[PDB]
């Protein structure tokens, strides 16, 4: 059966992409402070296989952690575009989710989903490092659910 072989191959590639998630060394604010608290020895993302890389060319997921300013937004869009193709976005905190405390500001993009397509929204101000790790594992499950080879085979 070609369906079974294609499903198992797709599960293999999803396992690889979810076991090796490389976020970018990119944060903006207090939410990025909690992001490096998720990098801290307690909730070891490197134990989870999640390790920061500075360049967007070696990154897999942008963790938008902070307030996306109007002046910042072209930089964030350029940095996201410069990623290679299997790229994900985890919005983190109320600022990146929907503006948060600075929703009615003249200089704040009301949510980073106006700029980049967001895969996972993590609520909080700040969300705890445990909550960000929860969002990371939820992203891992989300890309475990993907069926690219099966959609291609039935295409």
């Amino acid at each position: 059966r070609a369906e079974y072989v294609v499903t198992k191959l797709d599960d293999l590639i999803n396992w690889a992409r979810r076991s090796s998630l490389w976020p970018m060394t990119f944060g903006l604010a207090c939410c990025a402070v909690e992001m490096m608290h998720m990098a801290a020895p307690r909730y070891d993302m490197d134990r989870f296989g999640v390790v920061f890389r500075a360049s967007p060319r070696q990154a897999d997921v942008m963790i938008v952690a902070g307030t996306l300013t109007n002046k910042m937004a072209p930089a964030l869009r350029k940095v996201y575009d410069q990623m290679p193709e299997p790229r994900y976005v985890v919005s983190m905190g109320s600022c990146a989710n929907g503006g948060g405390y600075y929703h009615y500001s003249y200089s704040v993009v009301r949510g980073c989903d106006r700029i980049v397509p967001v895969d996972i929204y993590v609520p909080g101000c700040p969300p705890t490092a445990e909550a960000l790790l929860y969002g990371i594992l939820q992203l891992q499950r989300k890309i475990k659910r993907e069926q690219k080879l099966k959609i291609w085979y039935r295409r």
């Binding site: 109007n70 002046k71 937004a73 009615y104 500001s105 003249y106 200089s107 106006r114 700029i115």
Partner: protein, 207 residues
């Protein structure tokens, strides 16, 4: 009284004496000298005397205020000169703080004090960016906090809280584009003013 602060009339008297001292040293520029009940000395001067007043306070022997703490502006859009430019100065030698006030309008610039304090460079850039108060003889006076193509000075009272434009990614032009602002929520202003006065000490005389 365990819920009320102490007063320190001694430092109130000291600041009053120093206010007399500065006001008689510089009568050409000083328009008002006041000391608050919080023991803070404010000297309100003419805009032409910003450089001599700040130089005197930077290096006078009895008034060494060599550190500039703050430089800000307050938009009061009911007076003729709608911007009050405020300098908060620190004296490490005498362990004191002074406040110097001047005024401006949208078309009356003030001489920059970068030649006196170097922090005034970025502080006056911020004042120009947020209030539109131009500064004479400022090296590279430009915006510091707004977006690059931003129009208007947002800390003014007549500028809206949400601004006039907002940014979004457009896939047709593949850019981050600016649109007129359209809120899905419309920030609700609250009239949180009691119709009964709270402080009879500040009751203004009737018109």
């Amino acid at each position: 009284r365990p819920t009320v602060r102490p007063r320190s009339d001694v430092t109130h008297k000291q600041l009053s004496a120093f206010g007399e001292y500065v006001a008689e040293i510089l009568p050409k520029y000083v328009q008002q000298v006041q000391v608050s009940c919080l023991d803070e000395l404010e000297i309100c001067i003419h805009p032409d005397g910003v450089i001599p007043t700040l130089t005197f306070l930077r290096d006078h022997t009895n008034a060494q205020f060599k550190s500039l703490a703050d430089l800000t502006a307050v938009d009061v859009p009911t007076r003729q000169n709608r911007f009050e430019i405020v300098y908060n100065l620190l004296s490490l030698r005498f362990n004191s703080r002074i406040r110097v006030k001047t005024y401006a309008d949208e078309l009356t610039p003030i001489d920059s004090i970068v030649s006196v304090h170097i922090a005034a460079n970025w502080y006056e850039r911020e004042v120009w960016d947020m209030f539109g108060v131009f500064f004479f003889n400022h090296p590279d006076l430009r915006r510091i906090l707004t977006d690059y193509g931003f129009e208007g000075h947002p800390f003014r009272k007549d500028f809206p809280l949400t601004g006039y434009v907002e940014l979004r990614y457009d896939d047709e032009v593949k850019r981050v584009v600016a649109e007129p602002v359209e809120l899905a929520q419309e920030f609700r202003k609250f009239d949180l003013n009691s119709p009964w006065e709270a402080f009879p000490a500040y009751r203004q005389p009737p018109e």
